[PDB]
Write a protein that binds this ligand. Structure first.
Ligand SMILES: *Cc1cc(-c2c[nH]c3ncnc(N4CCOCC4)c23)ccc1O
Length: 250
């Protein structure tokens, strides 16, 4: 239903590990999009065949402004290619790098658009992890936009998932707190230079605020960063927490 002969590829958008991401244009409409290459070399040794071809079917029928649209996919002999929305202002990762820290307005706005994008996913009975700043792209209007749903680096994982317990959708409200902290402070709250330390930090939820973090964020962050899932606010509440409303954008 789609082949590489339909696209002229262009500039590399990003690269590394299992394949590459190229900007490209669909010939018969001149549509600008993004192609993800996989090589399938990692399909073996990860056995992640059907993997995504399953996640592909899931995401491909999701639709929302703060979620990066996936269009289709196709089999090369060697490579596997994904066809995604192209996001003109790149990752939040790069911008966090460029700016070091975010102000409360940009932080609380991103947090809003994220909170909305998740409740929609919950409503389609979709839960997950990631939401690492490398997986948040920016639309032409600066709107946040969630990349994919798929050891690892640990620091966005919640205590219940790393203790090996069971996890529901409340995983995503951990994540929200983690990012809102990273967005305000420049680094994630349980960062370490060791997988083993970070692991400790996360399971004991040990974080401290630098002084410049205001009380309204300390509050929101705190409420999201609790070892006990059932004690994390509901998305509905997050969207309406004063500091959000006070600082968020229209
Ligand atoms: C698989 C994947 C695809 C992208 C992606 C989608 N649209 C983009 N527009 C600009 N840049 C990027 N990336 C890709 C990776 O490095 C540069 C940022 C876009 C994003 C993340 C991802 O996992």
């Amino acid at each position: 239903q789609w082949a590489l002969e339909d696209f002229e590829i262009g500039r590399p958008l990003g690269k590394g590990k299992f394949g590459n991401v190229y900007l490209a244009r669909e010939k018969q409409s001149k549509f600008i999009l993004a192609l993800k290459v996989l090589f399938k070399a990692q399909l073996e040794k990860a056995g992640v065949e059907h993997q995504l071809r399953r996640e592909v079917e899931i995401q491909s029928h999701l639709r929302h402004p703060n979620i990066l649209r996936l269009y289709g996919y196709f089999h090369d002999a060697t490579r596997v290619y994904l066809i995604l929305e192209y996001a003109p202002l790149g990752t939040v990762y790069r911008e966090l790098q460029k700016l070091s820290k975010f102000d409360e307005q940009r932080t609380a706005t991103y947090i809003t658009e994220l909170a909305n994008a998740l409740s929609y996913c919950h409503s389609k009975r979709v839960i997950h992890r990631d939401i690492k700043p490398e997986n948040l792209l920016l639309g032409s209007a600066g709107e946040l936009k969630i990349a994919d749903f798929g050891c690892g680096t640990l620091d966005y994982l919640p205590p219940e998932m790393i203790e090996g317990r069971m996890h529901d959708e409340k995983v995503d409200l951990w994540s929200l707190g983690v990012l809102c902290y990273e967005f305000l402070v420049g680094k994630p709250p349980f960062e370490a230079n060791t997988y083993q330390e970070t692991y400790k930090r996360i399971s004991r939820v040990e974080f401290t605020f630098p002084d410049f973090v205001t009380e309204g964020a300390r509050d929101l962050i705190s409420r999201l960063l609790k070892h006990n899932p059932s004690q994390r606010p509901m998305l509905r509440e997050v969207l309406e927490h004063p500091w959000i409303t006070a600082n968020s954008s229209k």
